Scaffold this active site. Structure first.
Site, PDB file in Angstrom:
ATOM      1  N   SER A 119      40.521  42.490  43.858  1.00  0.00           N
ATOM      2  CA  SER A 119      40.917  41.396  44.788  1.00  0.00           C
ATOM      3  C   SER A 119      42.158  40.499  44.181  1.00  0.00           C
ATOM      4  O   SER A 119      42.165  39.202  43.949  1.00  0.00           O
ATOM      5  CB  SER A 119      39.827  40.271  45.129  1.00  0.00           C
ATOM      6  N   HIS A 147      33.854  42.496  46.856  1.00  0.00           N
ATOM      7  CA  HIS A 147      34.632  42.317  47.994  1.00  0.00           C
ATOM      8  C   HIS A 147      34.758  43.347  49.020  1.00  0.00           C
ATOM      9  O   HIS A 147      35.382  43.354  50.192  1.00  0.00           O
ATOM     10  CB  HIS A 147      36.309  42.222  47.311  1.00  0.00           C
ATOM     11  N   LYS A 179      31.040  36.465  49.290  1.00  0.00           N
ATOM     12  CA  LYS A 179      32.425  36.602  50.107  1.00  0.00           C
ATOM     13  C   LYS A 179      32.221  36.756  51.452  1.00  0.00           C
ATOM     14  O   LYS A 179      32.862  36.118  52.201  1.00  0.00           O
ATOM     15  CB  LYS A 179      32.784  37.805  49.164  1.00  0.00           C
TER      16      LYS A 179
END
Lengths: 187, 187
Positions: A119, A147, A179
């Site tokens: 990320s 993620h 997330k």
């Protein structure tokens, strides 16, 4: 809103058991554990199952929690350039040949650490080839799907669904509920 | 005056059993075997119990039969200067550290070969210190008492009697009946 204590002492309820079962069924594996922090999970896993005579070959763009967890155990670390697999195979062969530093005895264990999606670059990890080398050279695989889980794939299972890889070639899978689930914790 | 065949097929008699028992009692060990040649004994022993991943540290003045027997097996050979023990300890330490050549894996076994009396110099072997290093570094000991047995010691038992060493620290003892018994063979 109050816990009792550690999970081993009084802290367990039926909700924890249900959550563990449901997460394990969702991912596609057999069993799972849940914690109250992702950083703590990554920091305290490798200390538990590693030692100073083992080797860890991790990507150069890994998260800080993985680095702290590996540093706490004592194992040796070697990194390969991001998105390069010829270098990974070359490093694997050379490190199997060389052995432990200054003693040259065989490596007791070798673990490979990666991430489902990095990320800061937006790129994925070449999972099929990682599985190929881990099967060929008898290594182990660790994947960090912070993620990827929940937000990627045809139905939202991560990179295993994206690449069609059976989620049995990956030894350890971990992620966080922070997330893409609007909560806290890790598994 | 005629034998039948190999000892395993028909060749054994009661005289062989009596000779083996009497030799074993005379030396001070538990059991023994007898052959029809000394050269053959030394040539065919190491082939039987050694391999190519082992190491042999033998004196530089050893007999030819020991050299042929070691060459037939496949093990690695390193020699130390005659009558020098500091060099022997240094070589032992260095060869334990280094490991197998070109692979650096631990040595599977280490054997030390010497002679009770070298029949071109007239000198003995420093048996007590050899026992000290073999006990300290976990090696094995092989002694060739061709010229010592029968003709040396207070009662004629060899170098173990001369140095007062208990004949249990020496793993393998061999000799011949040719030199001081007026016969042929080995044990």
């Amino acid at each position: 809103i109050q816990s009792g204590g550690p999970r081993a002492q009084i802290g367990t309820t039926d909700l924890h058991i249900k959550a563990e079962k449901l997460v394990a069924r969702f991912i596609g594996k057999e069993d799972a554990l849940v914690f109250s922090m992702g950083y703590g999970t990554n920091a305290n896993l490798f200390n538990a199952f590693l030692d100073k005579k083992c080797l860890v070959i991790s990507d150069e763009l890994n998260h800080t929690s993985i680095r702290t967890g590996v540093r706490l155990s004592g194992a040796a670390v070697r990194t390969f350039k991001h998105g390069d697999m010829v270098g990974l195979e070359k490093l694997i062969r050379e490190q199997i040949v060389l052995g432990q530093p200054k003693t040259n005895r065989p490596w007791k264990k070798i673990l490979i650490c990666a991430e489902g999606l990095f990320s800061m670059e937006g790129t994925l990890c070449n999972l099929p080839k990682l599985v190929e080398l881990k099967k060929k050279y008898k290594c182990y695989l660790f994947i960090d799907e912070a993620h990827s889980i929940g937000a990627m794939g045809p139905t939202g299972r991560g990179v295993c669904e994206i690449f069609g890889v059976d989620p049995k070639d990956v030894d350890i899978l971990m992620g966080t509920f922070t997330k893409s689930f609007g909560a806290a914790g890790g598994y």
